[PDB]
Design a protein around this ligand. Structure first.
Ligand SMILES: *[C@@H](O)[C@H](Cc1ccccc1)NC(=O)[C@@H](NC(=O)OCc1ccccc1)C(C)C
Length: 220
């Protein structure tokens, strides 16, 4: 596979968004992965509605601001036959009744692919598919205050993930410890967080923070 991948340079990725004070990371991860696959198919990058998923994907198993799963989000778009754009169905950071309107749907998918729980398998998917939805253990003060460099948290769990994010690539950079590989991760905490809203997470370091444990993408 390539040593370095950055799907932002290919036009697959919208600007960093902000979920606010709502447990809806899973919806931002899902829209990001679907935004990439819709671009792959149509050549048009359109921001998609997280509020659509928060409000409407309950029947697939999601719980709005109280958590959810990207796979469930991908299931909703398939079962629902569409997903509205972000401009038509903007984000309110609160759970409301479903207001989906198919006339403003800009995205569809025919299911989703679960990536084996191997960092090598995740690398193959990022190199060939596009941005991938992943779950990580982000429940550490070090993650809140991250600014730059490769993020490594010794107390991160590979099995207790609590935060959905989007792998848009991977790469390397020389470091003190010679642990130079990283996943390029788009967060949904606004661009003031981290590096323009992005973080470089340690790659090939015992599945750090569980990044390969719950990876998937929509089929478009
Ligand atoms: C990210 O904003 C969100 C925060 C949160 C963590 C734990 C519990 C609630 C909310 N993280 C997730 O949604 C989390 N999902 C998760 O733990 O899946 C289990 C689940 C919880 C609630 C409803 C349905 C499933 C990420 C995506 C792993």
């Amino acid at each position: 596979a390539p040593r370095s991948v950055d799907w932002r340079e290919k036009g697959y990725v919208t600007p960093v968004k902000n979920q606010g004070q709502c447990g809806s990371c899973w919806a931002f991860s899902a829209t990001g992965a679907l935004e990439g696959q819709m671009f792959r198919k149509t050549g048009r990058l359109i921001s998609l509605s997280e509020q659509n998923l928060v409000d409407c994907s309950g029947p697939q198993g999601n719980e709005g601001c109280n958590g959810g799963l990207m796979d469930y989000a991908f299931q909703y778009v398939q079962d629902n036959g569409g997903l509205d754009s972000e401009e038509s169905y903007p984000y309110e950071a609160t759970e409301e009744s479903c207001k989906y309107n198919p006339k403003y749907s800009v995205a569809n998918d025919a299911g989703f692919v679960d990536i084996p729980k191997q960092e090598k398998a995740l690398m193959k998917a990022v190199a060939t598919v596009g941005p991938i939805s992943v779950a990580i253990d982000a429940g550490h003060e070090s993650f809140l205050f991250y600014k730059e460099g490769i993020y490594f948290e010794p107390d991160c769990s590979s099995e207790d993930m609590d935060h959905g994010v989007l792998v848009v690539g991977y790469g390397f950079e020389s470091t003190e410890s010679d642990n130079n590989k990283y996943w390029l991760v788009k967060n949904s905490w606004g661009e003031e967080w981290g590096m323009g809203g992005y973080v470089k997470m340690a790659k090939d370091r015992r599945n750090h923070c569980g990044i390969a444990s719950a990876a998937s993408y929509p089929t478009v």
